[PDB]
Design an enzyme around this catalytic site. Structure first.
Site, mmCIF file in Angstrom:
data_model
loop_
_atom_site.group_PDB
_atom_site.id
_atom_site.type_symbol
_atom_site.label_atom_id
_atom_site.label_comp_id
_atom_site.label_asym_id
_atom_site.label_seq_id
_atom_site.Cartn_x
_atom_site.Cartn_y
_atom_site.Cartn_z
ATOM 1 N N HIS A 30 -8.091 -3.629 -5.350
ATOM 2 C CA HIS A 30 -8.064 -5.144 -4.183
ATOM 3 C C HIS A 30 -8.622 -6.060 -3.910
ATOM 4 O O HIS A 30 -8.586 -6.803 -3.976
ATOM 5 C CB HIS A 30 -8.019 -3.826 -3.140
ATOM 6 C CG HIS A 30 -7.579 -4.317 -2.243
ATOM 7 N ND1 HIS A 30 -8.135 -5.104 -1.220
ATOM 8 C CD2 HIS A 30 -6.104 -4.507 -1.088
ATOM 9 C CE1 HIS A 30 -7.690 -5.684 -0.025
ATOM 10 N NE2 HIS A 30 -6.671 -5.466 -0.040
ATOM 11 N N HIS B 70 -15.600 -67.951 25.334
ATOM 12 C CA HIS B 70 -15.024 -65.574 25.864
ATOM 13 C C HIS B 70 -14.466 -66.000 26.783
ATOM 14 O O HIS B 70 -14.881 -64.845 27.354
ATOM 15 C CB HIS B 70 -16.390 -65.440 25.533
ATOM 16 C CG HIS B 70 -16.538 -65.124 23.210
ATOM 17 N ND1 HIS B 70 -15.096 -65.547 22.788
ATOM 18 C CD2 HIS B 70 -17.763 -65.036 22.945
ATOM 19 C CE1 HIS B 70 -15.655 -65.492 21.185
ATOM 20 N NE2 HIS B 70 -16.886 -65.726 21.710
ATOM 21 N N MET C 248 0.925 -1.590 0.303
ATOM 22 C CA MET C 248 -0.131 -0.339 -0.217
ATOM 23 C C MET C 248 0.541 1.124 0.170
ATOM 24 O O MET C 248 0.337 2.446 -0.141
ATOM 25 C CB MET C 248 -1.262 0.347 1.377
ATOM 26 C CG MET C 248 -1.822 -1.452 1.417
ATOM 27 S SD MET C 248 -3.306 -1.294 2.110
ATOM 28 C CE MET C 248 -2.781 0.194 3.089
HETATM 29 O O1 LIG Z 1 -17.331 -67.362 17.844
HETATM 30 C C1 LIG Z 1 -16.036 -67.615 17.672
HETATM 31 C C2 LIG Z 1 -14.711 -66.302 18.359
HETATM 32 O O2 LIG Z 1 -13.752 -66.576 18.247
HETATM 33 C C3 LIG Z 1 -13.263 -68.161 17.643
HETATM 34 C C4 LIG Z 1 -11.701 -68.716 17.551
HETATM 35 O O3 LIG Z 1 -12.105 -69.437 17.559
HETATM 36 C C5 LIG Z 1 -13.798 -68.230 16.354
HETATM 37 O O4 LIG Z 1 -14.023 -69.837 15.749
HETATM 38 C C6 LIG Z 1 -15.456 -67.972 15.633
HETATM 39 O O5 LIG Z 1 -16.004 -66.318 14.889
#
Ligand SMILES: O=C1CO[C@H](CO)[C@@H](O)[C@@H]1O
Ligand SMILES: O=C1CO[C@H](CO)[C@@H](O)[C@@H]1O
Ligand SMILES: O=C1CO[C@H](CO)[C@@H](O)[C@@H]1O
Ligand SMILES: O=C1CO[C@H](CO)[C@@H](O)[C@@H]1O
Ligand SMILES: [Mg+2]
Ligand SMILES: [Mg+2]
Ligand SMILES: [Zn+2]
Ligand SMILES: [Zn+2]
EC number: 4.2.1.110
Lengths: 880, 880
Positions: free
Chosen positions: B141, B618, B106
């Site tokens: 500008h 499990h 400017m």
């Molecule tokens: O029920 C399940 C969870 O984990 C297991 C591991 O042997 C799987 O075989 C299946 O998917």
């Protein structure tokens, strides 16, 4: 324990560069080599000279606030190619040695070119250093500096790839240059030709110091068409040792042998292996190995070549994607991994773009596996600790970009910073991704919050690692593993959570502490002078500040952590009106591995005098919570829990006399407050929440002015097994033992059936046939923060564990797939007046106490039972 | 439901640029405006002309494989400043209008400069477009293109900031240029001066089309020293409407008024608000508001200025950090947020570096809150959908860098891509961070894996959003929320998990589906021809391919997902030897918010004929698992669970007749297999694991050749409440009701004490005094995937919920802080032969059924009790 790869915070050192070929780690001073700079550049063109830009390391200075790499133009050169450095002037500064005047390509070699020259380090950070000529030889492609025929001078080995345009068949002089007594006088350096080779594409150096006395002089490794080759001097003569020939020639293809080669350290041996890339700009990765029990080093052994990968075909000009291989202890276990610099390919292909990091997985058989570290073109790699004082190895790369041959997009330089902690912003809260302390070989420190007169620092420790603290000032709170220190009263130890309803000081009283077999992940509370001094009379006094390191991403660096009054928090819902009661969020700590699992959630709280943070029981969400108080405004603030049952207590008009108080003083943490089964599994509600009695933080009673704030840190752990109610006596040291049954003569021992590693292998009592089956060995160890133990096979690792479900007469087996919280593989110990030991499972509420037991009075099988005291007594002999 | 901010995947459009000033979204064709390009540049210098580089949008073409933005040099100009575009040639291609020849600053204005010119779009992507001169005026500008006095031609408004060097006090002509009939003939454009203003620093345009008929012509908004100003033409005359004066002048400070201004849409009003930045390059953010019930648009209302933030002091030349403000519906709720472009400051300071995004939080009071979106210098902002066809708004920025004034490091252009899913590599596995579907207003699709003849695509849906699928071919598996479709048999619905031990087809049989009130997060299984065709005879046939979009980070794009035979997996431990049984990992889905909470973990599995994936329960780790089978090799593969108790079943030599089988056919998912309390909370083990009977996947029996693989996807959910055992009858439609007690005459209704929103407000039966207290309203709704309901206050939202703990005679209250899995705020319903309804809590195993009840026969308090059938009958009248 096998070493894990560390993590890598990437950072952009220089971007949008015109081109790129070379990158190097440049220690400014030649005395020290931590936090070096980076020098990098490209081959330039006929239109534009290449700036050999030395980029300043911002982390080079501690108290760092910058992430930016300041570019200093070292010089401006006609087609530079290769470089190295050494203290030519013997003044403790590194001087750069560089070749330039190559030509534009191997079909455009400069007849009067291949210049070799040195750039004098002037001791400061001005640009444009005085240049001098060492010497010329057409086609000059690579060089290294060291002490090859003499120690009292800098020497340079330099090697053209070709001698003239398109001439792929005439070999080049392997040249040695020598500093004069006075390199500062413009004159020619003494030279010697020490051999002729074909198409040398890499020079690697093995310093005399690394050979543990074997070699008084530096060893030259040459990767060329003749293959991978070792030349060394001994004081009187040059000799040569062929490591191998590399790629066997094919008809029509001018390239064979090798393009790069590097020497890998393995343990005490600096030449555990030589790794290689074939041929010139080829796609083939291989490794030379020597027979087990070979002498150390290169020349005393015969080397054999094994191919590991061929990353796909070659184009019409017989090239591929691999430009360099280098060696470096990436994971810090004393063995060198090797990295492969991938130029990128055509069409595009990530398999061939970036760095592959190979790890020597099996020392005996010399097996490797590769991981991908980076997936943006690597024309060259340089390694060095670029951000701390420890011995982590960071990785810098420059993109491979040459116009009229191969161009990658956004040619740049980035570095990948070794670290065991990573920081990512979510929204208002932060994610701290952490390595498993168990398997790192690196200490990592990352400051995050500066609050209440303390610098809150997240810290990961390798097993048996030392943290040097400030005696009586520093404090710690273990989140995983264990730490330990000793003063006049002996050993002290800290674990994720102390004894239910207990109280432990967080103050380290020694000058250092040490981590446990499992390492540790902790919050170190460092003394700060930037966040006020207790007592705290106002929240304005307790403003906290964002402490993350310059090398953390920007969004994280830009975050503020205000204190918000609980009444105003979104989850408040009309509650806590008019209470000097505040809250700061927040910091997730999660494991960086493929489980992505939670370690802890952390947030903060404050209470003014006479304030109750409210009674609750955590029915809303599941966690095992431990508070660490930082500042106790009255000296009397702490945790209250209800002693009456839940029905009997009105949280709103709470009758404090159905309540008990634990003062959590300055710099203390308290023990668990939640309900627990007798051996320390938590009670669980119907909605899967850790079952807690009614409880609250209450600040000291009395006058709200002068004000005085409690400040505490909440630690929200996922479920685990804590200590036992009541605490058992200590009747057993951990150690390696034989576990035996019987009396004076007739005895048998606990054993894993045929020493077999498989899950679900039976566990037995093997008769001690005096013929000599020999009693099996068992490692017994305490579980931290419990009163339980586990028994693991000395040989396989298999855990002694009752099969599912633990009932009267269940069979016992060895496993590496234990149940959560050690439910069937952890034991409560007793010891009778004889000395015998008993192992009990976490008692379930139906089945009685079940002990590890034999089943009779050939192999007797092993069971857990409750009925007989006799079958469950064990004698522990120390084994080995 | 308040709209959440979406997520932002950043991507580097152009790096290491010399400088930077301007960035713009450039739709190549003028017909359509999705996936435009970006044009950007800097002011250049006396040494080097500035390349106005148009960067090609790679996502502009679907089937995209590139992330790279290809630079096309549009031209090379002496100090360009501002630009815009419009179809000058009336041929459906956008032509660029640009000013240049400004001067260097400017205080260096060019006397014969301020050139305004247009670059002709040649209909293709060659560089260097024919340039023509529109006209000159020193100091030029800013400019915009539109239809200001006439519709049948392109017109340009152009405005110098000053007229000459350092002259801050002489005002400039507001100029209008007009296309000739034939712009392709080199000649001068017709011009008019339409007013004179002081230091205009921004021009903003409000198209005639947005005014919903109010204005036939385009409205000019000017931000200058005179303030924020609106000029428009009506067909006969110009008139002016002052919005405000902006910053009040201070002595010695040449800058006051405004530097930028933008018009915010709110609902049906395109001028809900005007936002502003003060003064020229100032640090002050403010907003002009008009009184509630004002007319739509700008000129029919009187505007008042409120200051929101002052980001800190000014330097000696009286400047600051804010260069631009713009408006855009970032969160897609029909109200415009505004973004502030932060240049960066000196010393450095993140508060002043990047983009702040302000959200209008309260429409009545016009309250805003700001979030930080980016923390790397923004000299200019451009918004547009840069990657899809939907109506997300992405954010592009260019760094503000001018040498000899203010320079940021690594001057570059990046764009921030709106998305509800983000993808981050962990190690072998991937992290998919997702928004809450509940509060996005955007559909998001991200393909990840191409396997088993299907393209696995993660999909987030806003509430009541439609997904157009392929009738009978497409399939879905809901992870959060609910989806719904209808064919000849009526409505069908899909929720995270169907009925225990059930089986549901995943095949959408309609041409589209729709999401529930809560939206949905799902895996869409698209038909693929790139991943083979069933039956699958070999794993080589089932190779899967990495499908993530070009705009995902590279480390993720570079990942392979091999099938590893379970025996070889690290967690195998001698198990599953010799089994055609394989596993692919893996994909974490977690919420992107501050909870960082898990949604699901997903991985894959295959089984050959006669193969059992092994029996398990499990005990090792906690999850509610649902499998979706993709390919069933025999037609007979599925899930087996043990019917005997755990003790009674030997997992190793499993007696299949203590087992029951559920065939999970092609494209089906099955119901929960874990143990559950009668109203569907899961049973929990002592180590806090969802309690499961022994179970396994078993492939069809018979001949292993020809081979034929089962392929299924595991979905690992955290604990939730499923359906009830046994399933209750459906006796209640959800809807708004009054909840009443009594008989013909004497009646009372359920009520929240004084309609109060606070947690723990009592719930009562209020006598229906025929005086007229009026019966309170309650929203009752089904909980998806359960057989339970909740009752929420029509007015506050408060949930009807028993206080802790739920026992005989507990008090009932309203809460927004319910317990996990609705433990005390979800009800099982019955209906007697009268028609009365009863509400029962999840029955605990000790206390009996507890019903929502009154306590007598002034307000009667409300309780849960088990004793009396009479006190718990309720009559539901529909309310409103
Ligand atoms: O029920 C399940 C969870 O984990 C297991 C591991 O042997 C799987 O075989 C299946 O998917
Ligand atoms: O896997 C785990 C085992 O121990 C850790 C703490 O020391 C846990 O937090 C973690 O989730
Ligand atoms: O125990 C605790 C957990 O959550 C409470 C919220 O009122 C806190 O007061 C305290 O930190
Ligand atoms: O907070 C939550 C509530 O519902 C989701 C599923 O629909 C859960 O997975 C999530 O953790
Ligand atoms: Mg020197
Ligand atoms: Mg046109
Ligand atoms: Zn190593
Ligand atoms: Zn919006």
């Amino acid at each position: 324990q096998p070493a894990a790869l560390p993590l890598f915070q990437p950072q952009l050192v220089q971007g949008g560069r015109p081109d790129g070929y070379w990158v190097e780690a440049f220690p400014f001073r030649s005395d020290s080599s931590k936090c070096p700079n980076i020098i990098g550049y490209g081959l330039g063109t006929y239109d534009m000279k290449s700036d050999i830009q030395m980029l300043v390391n911002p982390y080079a200075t501690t108290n760092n606030q910058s992430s930016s790499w300041t570019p200093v133009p070292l010089a401006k050169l006609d087609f530079p190619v290769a470089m190295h450095y050494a203290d030519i002037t013997k003044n403790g500064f590194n001087d750069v040695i560089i070749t330039d005047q190559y030509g534009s390509s191997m079909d455009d070699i400069w007849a009067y070119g291949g210049r070799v020259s040195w750039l004098e380090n002037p001791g400061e950070l001005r640009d444009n250093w005085t240049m001098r000529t060492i010497g010329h030889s057409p086609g000059m492609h690579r060089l290294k500096a060291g002490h090859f025929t003499r120690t009292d001078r800098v020497q340079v080995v330099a090697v053209p790839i070709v001698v003239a345009s398109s001439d792929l068949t005439t070999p080049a002089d392997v040249i040695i240059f020598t500093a004069p007594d006075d390199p500062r006088s413009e004159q020619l350096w003494q030279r010697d030709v020490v051999g002729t080779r074909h198409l040398v594409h890499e020079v690697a150096i093995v310093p005399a110091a690394e050979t543990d006395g074997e070699m008084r002089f530096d060893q030259i490794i040459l990767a060329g068409r003749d293959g991978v080759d070792c030349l060394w001097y001994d004081g009187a003569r040059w000799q040569r040792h062929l490591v191998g020939t590399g790629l066997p020639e094919e008809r029509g293809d001018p390239y064979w042998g090798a393009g790069s080669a590097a020497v890998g350290r393995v343990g005490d041996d600096y030449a555990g292996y030589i790794c290689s890339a074939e041929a010139f700009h080829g796609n083939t990765v291989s490794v030379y190995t020597k027979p087990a029990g070979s002498p150390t080093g290169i020349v005393r052994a015969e080397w054999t070549r094994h191919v590991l990968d061929v990353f796909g075909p070659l184009n019409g000009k017989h090239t591929g994607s691999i430009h360099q291989v280098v060696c470096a202890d990436i994971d810090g276990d004393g063995e060198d991994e090797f990295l492969v610099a991938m130029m990128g390919a055509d069409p595009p292909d990530f398999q061939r773009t970036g760095v592959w990091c190979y790890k020597l997985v099996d020392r005996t058989n010399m097996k490797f596996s590769k991981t991908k570290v980076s997936s943006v073109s690597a024309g060259r790699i340089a390694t060095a600790n670029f951000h701390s004082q420890g011995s982590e190895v960071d990785i810098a790369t420059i993109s491979y970009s040459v116009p009229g041959y191969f161009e990658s997009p956004n040619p740049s330089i980035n570095v990948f910073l070794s670290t065991g902690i990573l920081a990512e912003r979510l929204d208002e809260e932060v994610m701290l991704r952490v390595v498993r302390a168990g398997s790192t070989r690196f200490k990592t420190e990352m400051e995050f919050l500066d609050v209440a007169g303390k610098k809150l620092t997240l810290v990961v420790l390798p097993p048996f690692a030392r943290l040097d603290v400030e005696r009586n000032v520093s404090g710690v709170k273990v989140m995983a593993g264990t730490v330990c220190w000793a003063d006049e009263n002996g050993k002290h130890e800290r674990v994720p959570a102390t004894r239910p309803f207990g109280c432990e000081s967080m103050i380290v009283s020694a000058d250092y502490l040490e981590s446990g077999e499992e390492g540790a992940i902790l919050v170190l509370y460092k003394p700060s002078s930037t966040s006020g001094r207790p007592p705290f009379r106002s929240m304005d006094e307790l403003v906290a500040h964002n402490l993350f390191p310059a090398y953390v991403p920007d969004s994280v660096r830009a975050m503020k952590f205000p204190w918000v009054r609980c009444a105003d928090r979104p989850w408040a819902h009309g509650r806590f009106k008019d209470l000097d009661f505040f809250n700061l969020i927040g910091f997730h700590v999660n494991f960086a591995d493929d489980s992505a699992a939670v370690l802890a959630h952390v947030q903060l709280w404050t209470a003014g005098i006479g304030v109750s943070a409210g009674f609750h029981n955590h029915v809303e969400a599941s966690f095992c919570e431990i508070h660490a108080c930082i500042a106790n405004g009255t000296g009397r603030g702490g945790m209250r829990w209800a002693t009456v049952p839940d029905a009997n207590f009105n949280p709103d008009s709470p009758n404090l006399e159905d309540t008990e108080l634990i003062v959590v003083p300055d710099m203390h943490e308290h023990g668990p407050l939640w309900r627990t089964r007798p051996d320390g599994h938590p009670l669980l509600r119907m909605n899967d929440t850790i079952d807690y009695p009614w409880h609250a933080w209450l600040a000291g009673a009395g006058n709200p002015s002068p004000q005085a704030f409690d400040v505490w840190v909440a630690f929200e752990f996922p479920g685990f097994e804590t200590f036992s109610t009541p605490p058992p006596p200590r009747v057993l040291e951990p150690g390696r033992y034989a576990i035996r049954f019987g009396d004076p003569h007739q005895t048998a021992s606990l054993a894993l059936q045929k020493n077999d590693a498989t899950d679900g292998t039976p566990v037995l009592a093997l008769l001690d046939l005096d013929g000599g089956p020999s009693p099996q060995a068992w490692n017994i160890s305490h579980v931290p923060g419990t009163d339980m133990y586990e028994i693991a096979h000395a040989k396989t690792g298999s855990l002694v564990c009752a099969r599912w479900p633990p009932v009267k007469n269940q069979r016992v087996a060895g496993t590496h797939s234990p149940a959560a919280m050690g439910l069937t593989s952890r034991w409560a110990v007793t010891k009778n007046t004889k000395g015998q030991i008993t192992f009990r499972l976490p008692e379930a509420p139906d089945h009685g106490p079940l002990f590890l037991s034999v089943s009779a009075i050939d192999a007797i099988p092993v069971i857990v039972q409750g009925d007989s005291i006799e079958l469950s007594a064990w004698s522990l002999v120390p084994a080995n």
